[PDB]
Structure 1
């Protein structure tokens, strides 16, 4: 059986909390293995392992269960348990009713029928929440490798929403091909040398900040992966999202410094997000309204 190390402790599949299969009920599909909304009552998201899978798929599934179960932070999705002693195997997560951040931004964009559905403060609160999760990973020497809007979840659709990092698939893989690496979220030393440090997540966080303030656009509009690689290697950076306040765009450009040592750590990023949150010239800026 495979082992896993985090925050000074080694853990094994015996440490995972096995939930009796009879206590688990599936309600509906959420998306793709398949993920279901379920109940244990506790509302859960059920990640399934296909019964027809390779031995490497099984080890990856067991590793992601160990990774998420060992985290303890308000901005990282909770693991309620697993159901590994029955087929198909399950990983049971905290059900984040707000869904994924990329879909939430796309669906909650201000429109004429709702011109204030989202404000600069909502986006700053999401950014702070994920930066708090990243700071926890940084201080525990865990490198995420795929900080992106698609990998973040929201507790609810409303103003009290809390954003959390919900996927650890890329980190699990490293603990396969070029066209699958998230090159649009990677710093130059990562896509060129395969060097990953805490400063890799800083660069990716800058890209997530762009995704958030653009309200869910795909980074580097109209550029392919090779074009992005050539652009970023040459010193090219994204333009500010539409109506993005200068102090927020400044955080993105600091996250995208070519030298990893010139990028801020997450403590500095949180200080800057907090300053943006306090600045009336920032939070009083209206987001664009999509006709």
Structure 2
């Protein structure tokens, strides 16, 4: 079964990871061997529609995209997926604000770009792409998660405002090109090692400054070449923004000569922590082999 219907006794929530905008995520074990998993319990028979979108979250198959392993429909709804041992990309760059070289930064951009392009091939608009919604399987590989939920929970029926495209803020219009805007902010978050976008500025005034032409500032380590891509992602005209397929090629090219596009001191010179962090056993990987 592509979307496993887990019985309440099959898994157990052990600790709290964090509270999101759609629900609370827990880390735990899945006993079909014990499999370390992340369990998302949504905030609030209608499960028919839920199972439908849930299916999409489970049918994705790409190395840069998280896959839903199962669902549990009791009073509330619980989504179960493989636990990403390094947590989310946002906290990761924050913690390693130093020891992170241009090679990693660019490789992540490529990876996230591949994941988004893949979702575009499945005609799936993410709607909530951000550094906090990118997981770290290993420092070498990251994966996009949390897609599908926005739509499911009524994102386009009568608020990540700082990651949203102008058209999304004003008209609830979400397309693959609105995802490209969010992609731009996500990249900005990486390059600034986790800065908060438009920090300080009130959400209600964002559409206003965007219309004025204001955009997130050029990250210190970025050559104007990398920043132009970010700016191009934030164009009012959605069709003028880069395509994920083009972003893949551009960031991949930049990844061949990282020190030419990103200027970080000591770039060249650039485990137990996450064990004591996440450890409460076979990877969902081995088990699902």
Q: Does 2:58 align with 1:77?
A: no
Q: Does 2:152 align with 1:172?
A: yes
Aligned to 2:286: none
Aligned to 1:125: 107
Aligned to 1:10: none
The answer to whether the 8 A contact 1:25-1:38 is kept is: yes
User: Could you tell me how far apart the structure 1 residues matched to 2:173 and 2:42 are?
Assistant: 30
Secondary structure class of the residue paired with 2:80: strand
User: Could you tell me how far apart the structure 2 residues matched to 1:155 and 1:218 are?
Assistant: 23
Secondary structure class of the residue paired with 2:79: strand
Secondary structure class of the residue paired with 2:125: coil
The match for 1:34 among 7, 24, 28 is 24
The verdict on how the C-alpha distance between 1:47 and 1:184 changes in structure 2, with shifts beyond 3 A counting, is same
The verdict on how the C-alpha distance between 1:49 and 1:224 changes in structure 2, with shifts beyond 3 A counting, is closer
Secondary structure class of the residue paired with 1:147: coil
User: Could you tell me how far apart the structure 2 residues matched to 1:220 and 1:63 are?
Assistant: 36
User: Could you tell me how far apart the structure 2 residues matched to 1:226 and 1:49 are?
Assistant: 26
1:21-100 matched pairs, under 5 angstroms: 21-32=8-19, 33-40=23-30, 41-49=34-42, 53=44, 62=51, 65-84=54-73, 86=74, 89-100=77-88
The answer to whether the 8 A contact 2:233-2:241 is kept is: yes
User: Could you tell me how far apart the structure 2 residues matched to 1:189 and 1:39 are?
Assistant: 41
The match for 1:147 among 96, 116, 129 is 129
Residue 90 of structure 1 and its aligned partner are, at CA, apart by 2.8
The answer to whether the 8 A contact 1:105-1:212 is kept is: yes
The verdict on how the C-alpha distance between 1:89 and 1:230 changes in structure 2, with shifts beyond 3 A counting, is closer
User: Could you tell me how far apart the structure 2 residues matched to 1:87 and 1:131 are?
Assistant: 37
User: Could you tell me how far apart the structure 1 residues matched to 2:226 and 2:266 are?
Assistant: 13
- 1:133-191 Cα shifts (integer Å, max 9, x gaps): 110111222111111112111113x4x3x11112123232248999xx22211222221
User: Could you tell me how far apart the structure 1 residues matched to 2:24 and 2:256 are?
Assistant: 42
What's the C-alpha RMSD, in Å, of the aligned pairs? Answer: 2.7
Residue 202 of structure 1 and its aligned partner are, at CA, apart by 1.0
Residue 197 of structure 1 and its aligned partner are, at CA, apart by 2.0
Aligned to 1:252: 230
The verdict on how the C-alpha distance between 1:208 and 1:49 changes in structure 2, with shifts beyond 3 A counting, is closer
User: Could you tell me how far apart the structure 2 residues matched to 1:60 and 1:107 are?
Assistant: 39
Runs of 4+ in 1 over 6 A off after TM superposition: 175-178
User: Could you tell me how far apart the structure 2 residues matched to 1:188 and 1:170 are?
Assistant: 17
The TM-score with structure 1 as length reference comes to: 0.79
User: Could you tell me how far apart the structure 1 residues matched to 2:85 and 2:175 are?
Assistant: 32
Structure 2: segments with no counterpart, 5+ residues: 268-289
User: Could you tell me how far apart the structure 2 residues matched to 1:49 and 1:278 are?
Assistant: 41
Residue 284 of structure 1 and its aligned partner are, at CA, apart by 5.5
Aligned to 1:11: none
Structure 1: segments with no counterpart, 5+ residues: 1-13, 111-116
User: Could you tell me how far apart the structure 2 residues matched to 1:183 and 1:87 are?
Assistant: 31
Aligned to 1:5: none
User: Could you tell me how far apart the structure 1 residues matched to 2:235 and 2:27 are?
Assistant: 40
Aligned residues: 259
